[PDB]
């Protein structure tokens, strides 16, 4: 038994999304399907549910208007549609099976989909600028990776051979673009005697660059 | 309709210890109550249904108790895997509200942040931008506050913060704070300061530079 959801979605303000939830391993019409929203650093919110036998949808108060559930019964699939998207829709969405039946003593959500990401931005694909962070017994260095869309970017130091002493921070969307940063800490006898380079990948623009961190004074 | 309060928001513990999380319902909810676990980047997973019943294949350490309005969730000896988020959910009447969630974190000795400041690179300045970066690394506990100053004046606009999860190796936290201005505004002021407030020091831990 599985719930399998569609992939990540990137939308500009005012567009529409439709995301799917495919169920397999059981009779599709036996159990209803529930939809949840989780905003970036936030908790789980129940949006509503759809009766898979009946087609009747129920919406929570916070999700009346732009939100529409539907079914394609022969493909064992439920859909969530959000019309006229805005910044507040940027979140992860989960479907989950409601386990209940006639005469049941218990009610709970047993199977969950793997979740699907929606990102709202006016931006088009944009490769990152990579800026060096150098100072001017230990020394801390960094790279600042500004101005890109969409996620993800990947970053290592010295091609993955510097992994201890590393902090790579989660990306934040500021005004339609992302910023991410990473620090690395070494003994002061290490650099600049040995070079230190950050390797930055952004698959969506097929960018792969290396940035050497050179010293800017004693 | 019906509110679910989950205290506390954050809980510290150690390996092999037991912890208890509460959940208070706004109305009588019978035993129509479930607990879920959520690991980072994954979907929730059912642990307990009907207030007290263990879901199939879930380890003995997990348990739940209560009925009416007062509910608890217990783990009896904590393993590395357990230090994640947990949610209660009411399943009596719509909408089926979730609690606000609790994250379990690992206790360690207090540690002051290591703070480093970086002026804009000449690379960035050529393009007409100016980002000042501070790293505040390997501190404990997780609570910390960062303030930027320009020529001694507090500045909130243009500041972008990011934070790592608890470190797997040393159990500390880190933070990155970036103050972005235009080149033109950056060249009109001299002194730039980031100031960290943290339990380990009565005074702020500050780094600074003059342009």
């Amino acid at each position: 038994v599985q719930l399998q959801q569609s992939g990540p979605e990137l939308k500009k303000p005012g567009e529409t999304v439709k995301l799917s939830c495919k169920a397999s391993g059981y009779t599709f019409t036996n159990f209803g399907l529930n939809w949840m929203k989780q905003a970036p650093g936030k908790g789980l919110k129940w949006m509503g549910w759809i009766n898979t036998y009946t087609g009747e949808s129920t919406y929570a108060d916070d999700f009346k208007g732009r939100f529409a559930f539907s079914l394609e019964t022969s493909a064992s699939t439920a859909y969530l549609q959000i019309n006229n998207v805005k910044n507040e829709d940027t979140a992860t969405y989960f479907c989950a099976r409601g386990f209940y039946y006639y005469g049941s003593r218990y009610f709970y959500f047993d199977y969950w989909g793997q979740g699907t990401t929606l990102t709202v931005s006016s931006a088009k694909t944009t490769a990152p600028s990579v800026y060096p962070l150098a100072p001017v017994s230990s020394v801390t260095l960094g790279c600042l990776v500004k101005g890109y869309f969409p996620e993800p970017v990947t970053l290592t130091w010295n091609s993955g051979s510097l992994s201890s002493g590393v902090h790579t921070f989660p990306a934040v969307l500021q005004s339609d673009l992302y910023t991410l940063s990473s620090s690395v800490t070494v003994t002061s006898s290490t650099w600049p005697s040995q070079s230190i380079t950050c390797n930055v990948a952004h698959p969506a623009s097929s960018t792969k660059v290396d940035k050497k961190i050179e010293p800017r004074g004693p | 309709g019906i509110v679910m309060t989950q205290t506390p928001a954050s809980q510290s513990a150690s390996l092999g210890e037991s912890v208890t999380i509460t959940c208070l319902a706004s109305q009588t909810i019978g035993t129509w109550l479930a607990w879920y676990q959520q690991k980072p980047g994954k979907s929730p997973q059912l642990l307990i249904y009907a207030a007290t019943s263990l879901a199939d294949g879930v380890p003995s350490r997990f348990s739940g108790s209560g009925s009416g309005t007062k509910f608890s969730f217990k783990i009896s000896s904590l393993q590395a895997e357990d230090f994640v988020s947990y949610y209660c959910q009411q399943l009596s009447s719509t909408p089926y509200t979730f609690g606000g969630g609790t994250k379990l974190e690992i206790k360690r000795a207090d540690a002051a942040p290591t703070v480093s400041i970086f002026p804009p690179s000449s690379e960035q300045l050529t393009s007409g931008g100016a980002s000042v970066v501070c790293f505040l690394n390997n501190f404990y506990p997780k609570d910390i506050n960062v303030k930027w100053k320009i020529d001694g004046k507090e500045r909130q606009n243009g500041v972008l913060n990011s934070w790592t999860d608890q470190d797997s190796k040393d159990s500390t936290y880190s933070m990155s704070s970036t103050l972005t201005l235009t080149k033109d505004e950056y060249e009109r002021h001299n002194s730039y300061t980031c100031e960290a407030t943290h339990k380990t020091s009565t005074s702020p831990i500050v780094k600074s530079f003059n342009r």
Binding site: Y53, T54, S104 | -
Partner: peptide, 13 residues
């Protein structure tokens, strides 16, 4: 027979 998907929904026959 009846299909009842939640505790407060009406059974469908």
């Amino acid at each position: 027979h009846f299909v009842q998907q939640t505790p407060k929904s009406q059974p469908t026959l």
